[PDB]
Structure to design on (98 residues):
């Protein structure tokens, strides 16, 4: 049972992407799982995974102009931490797209 990563930082944001960084937990870890969904979505999210050497990830294909909830879970084998949770609105709310 595993402590959560800390200090979610958004280092870049576009109309369709977010770059997400975090600080590792104190535990030995074997990966991270990242979920993302709009706050206004039914709420079951999309999921990605990364190796433990990744303490940042860029999420693409996002909807412009909406608040996303990003949740980062540390993994240790079959085990997962509670998530580190932060929010970010993508660019372009008042702009057309294509």
């Amino acid at each position: 049972m595993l402590d959560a990563p800390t200090d979610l930082q958004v280092t870049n944001v576009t109309d369709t992407s977010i770059t997400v960084s975090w600080t590792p937990p104190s535990a030995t870890i074997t990966g991270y799982r990242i979920t993302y969904t709009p706050s206004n979505g039914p709420g079951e999210p999309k999921e990605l995974t990364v190796p433990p050497s990744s303490t940042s990830v860029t999420i693409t294909g996002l909807t412009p102009g909406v608040e996303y909830v990003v949740s980062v879970y540390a993994l240790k084998d079959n085990q997962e931490s509670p998530p580190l949770v932060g929010t970010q609105t993508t660019g372009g709310h008042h702009h057309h797209h294509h």
